[PDB]
Amino acid sequence: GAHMVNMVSNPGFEDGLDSWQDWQQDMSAVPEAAHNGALGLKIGGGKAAGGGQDIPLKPNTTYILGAWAKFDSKPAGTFDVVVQYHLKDANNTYVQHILNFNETDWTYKQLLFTTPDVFGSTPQLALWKGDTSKANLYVDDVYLVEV
Ligand SMILES: OC[C@H]1O[C@@H](O[C@H]2[C@H](O)[C@@H](O)[C@H](O[C@H]3[C@H](O)[C@@H](O)[C@H](O[C@H]4[C@H](O)[C@@H](O)[C@H](O[C@H]5[C@H](O)[C@@H](O)[C@H](O)O[C@@H]5CO)O[C@@H]4CO)O[C@@H]3CO)O[C@@H]2CO)[C@H](O)[C@@H](O)[C@@H]1O
């Protein structure tokens, strides 16, 4: 109203891996992983792996983080979607806003948070598949919207 601002670049992986860092060389944008559109992100099983992007959030602002994910077989651990940054306080507090997934059917989760007055480091959006079973992880439509 009149627009909703989304802060995630290439949120649906429709531009492949554009804008996303592939930390463990274990990511591909493939039709297999799509929940919407032509592509989704597949993070390959067998080792902990993930990727992410840096996001310039505004201070004192309400954001909604949301994502769709599923594992293609039962995981031991989880796949986590995280917004993280440091505060500029005495303890340099590291803040993490976390969605945890372990489902084998496509599942949507979301959370709301409000950013501080000042950031101690540039916010990062992390897609972290910490599970080490053979399960592949699909994730799609990762949104971070200002309201
Ligand atoms: O690989 C080369 C590449 O590395 C980049 O650095 C990456 C690195 O590769 C990743 O391994 C690393 O992954 C970390 C995630 O970013 C971060 O979100 C995650 O944080 C954990 C946290 O440690 C943990 O305490 C927390 O537990 C919560 C549970 O999830 C909840 O269920 C429960 O209720 O509460 C607890 C406590 O809050 O979970 C979160 C989410 O999993 O830790 C990951 C590592 O274990 O990210 C690095 C980037 O930040 C590097 O930048 C590149 O330059 C390089 O090329």
Ligand SMILES: [Ca+2]
């Ligand atoms: Ca998609």
